[PDB]
């Protein structure tokens, strides 16, 4: 009770609730929050309304010189993001990163479109007390949880000051740090030591309410700490006991405006000029060059107004949910959501993942890739001969529902792909562009880039933004397919031809292939994921892929050359973006590197390059090359590379399983784990691991991740063994619980549930919970109804369950009949003779067996089934529950 603050606190703690809320707002300045709250209600994130009162507080501080935010701003305990968004409106600020705890009983970051929103990056679920410090130019911290006990607040405050000191030690000359309880002795001492070392002073905002004693240690203040605090205490004490409460003085809230901001700094225009010109002309009406466009590594050409496209909804699948009551309690399943594919949705991912420049590899690294890719092209073409693909081939393999991909009104004459390929007028458009290509010109081959609708873990209690996919229109895709599609159609990256690849194989083959690799002598199995593979394909990588041309001649070569040079290298792309005031715009941008996700040969070229990368890593691992060769390759090891490849290559690729950017490799020893110098120089940086930390390997091949699964060997009842795919049961159920959009009627969602159920039966029958849930779903869905919808995006999903045939029959087809690693072709006649994984593995991968929630669920499954049957209604049903032992 010694300090005046302690007297204030004690008097505060003794107030009645009614008086507390009068005193709280007495004589303070308060921003009118009315309009902001209506904005929050009406989902208006483009009107300039700040997410909290925190924007006004920071505004007051900069308008008074107390802090002048600049450069890279770090914001500790950002909450909704109030400070972060205000900083981003400021000219001198170029980057904002917020961190915050989030979760139950804490504020999550809110996603806004305030001016400069593209400079901001908020992160939730972070405990900053144990987050390693990072360099920054401006540092913010608004952490400090109140308490009726000054002693508690004192210790909390100290913990923050102690924490911020680690961050101040790394440069920030600008700062603004909350000091929750400034009047307590140990805090006073800490402030004095900190002020000496880093400067600044303690300030009390007139925007703060009288119910706290918070002060801000800001870099552009100064003064005696003690004096400052006592002056605050006195004001506070003075405002107690009034005869008449006069209330606060009202101010207007800050208006943060809207729209993206330009990034600083940021030219083979010949080969793209026609395309741009044709677009500028077709959309001249509102065409313009936005000075505030957010592109940093893409070159920008212009923008025009368009109607926004995409969705931000996730809806629940009612039938799956009814059959999965125990998972209602699993956060991992219920916080999953469809990704946001609105333009704001994809753009907020675009600025992090796609607008990056992967550096070109250094000269020595190039020379080694050169020899490797020479070797690899030679090896792939040892037996196979390139060829044109035909119109008829295209028409037969085009999905009747492939994207049209119109980029010009002229390309938008058909309502489905099937109609286009059936219309002579389409092929006339193709021919016309074809003849242009033969003359080394390209007029209309242009990508649309948009958000991919995906089922993913949530973010800030809501949906994640979307991954960008891009592809050219049906006509351009035909031309690609004609020139380069032989790679696909004649299976140039099949295992038989590539050694390392796995083209064509369903998931059901993948485990067996991993096992075969395990049988070779060598070290641990590795499986490093490259972060954002397509965005890391360099000019060098493209130049090496371009060596297909040397396998081609005449007309065939010329067509292929146009695809490769005019279409894969000189890419022109159309992407939507949020403009100001709720309107959206189509940007036309370009760049020479990176790989477009929806090129006809993306998988092939990815597989090809990934094999070459692994070959290079193995050479560094086996000693042929090292860091001393990155800047220049000596003639002698340049030759060793050649001979290494020549003598070893064919064996070495058999130690790989390469599916696009997905890789598994069993090197000779474990020097591989530190063979990272070339890997990093080639820009193929590893995902989720410090740049130079060695790679983790596995001893058990059954724990190796490949194409989103790992694989388990299980011995069946009749003594035969199978290798099956296995993965987190939480997400499997999480995804089945999500419907692809709004407005889906009972029958359609029932048919999607039925596809998820049947995919489970065919691939994850060995997971106890799923087999029960699958039979339960199929028992609640009318037998006649036909499975519809996507259950996977993986190229290795072959969809055998998308059928009305009995699932046991198809089980035998893929697991016995067509399974080349199963000698004994003895058919399985009943489900009970189909194995499970060990309960140890089942539980490790999310199973709920042995739990009482599950028990209740299992025992009462029929009630669940009947609930769904009622909703669907009188129809023809069948009970499959009896195919499980416990229901006989
Ligand atoms: N240890 C911790 N690590 C990260 N965040 C924390 C934390 N302790 C508290 N927080 C969070 O930090 C936030 C401070 S309130 C932030 C207000 C913000 N300046 C604005 O204007 O919007 C709270 O939401 C709180 O949940
Ligand atoms: Zn073209
Ligand atoms: Zn598993």
Residue numbers in the entry: 5 to 270, 274 to 895
Manuscript text:
Among those, the ≈900-residue non-structural protein 5 (NS5) comprises an N-terminal S-adenosyl-L-methionine (SAM)-dependent methyltransferase (MTase) domain, and a C-terminal RNA-dependent RNA polymerase (RdRP) region that harbors the classic thumb, palm, and fingers domains present in all single-subunit polymerases. Although MTase is common for viruses bearing a 5′ cap structure and RdRP is required for all RNA viruses, the flavivirus NS5 represents a unique natural fusion of these two important enzymes.
The structure was solved through comprehensive molecular replacement trials using multiple search models derived from the flavivirus MTase and RdRP crystal structures. Only three small segments of NS5 are unresolved in the full-length structure: residues 1–4 and 896–905 at the N- and C-termini, respectively, and residues 271–273 in the MTase-RdRP linker. The MTase (residues 1–266) is complexed with the S-adenosyl-L-homocysteine (SAH), the demethylated form of SAM. Mediated by the linker, the MTase domain is attached to the backside of the RdRP through key hydrophobic interactions (details below), shielding the top-right rim of NTP entry channel. Although quite some polar/electrostatic interactions are present in the interface, the heart of the interactions is the formation of a hydrophobic network. This involves residues Pro113, Leu115, and Trp121 from the MTase, and Phe467 (ring) Phe351 (index/βNLS core helix), and Pro585 (middle) from the RdRP fingers domain arranged in an alternating fashion. In the JEV NS5 structure, the Zn2+ bound to the pinky finger (Zn-1) has equivalent coordination partners (E440-H444-C449-C452) as previously observed, likely playing structural roles.
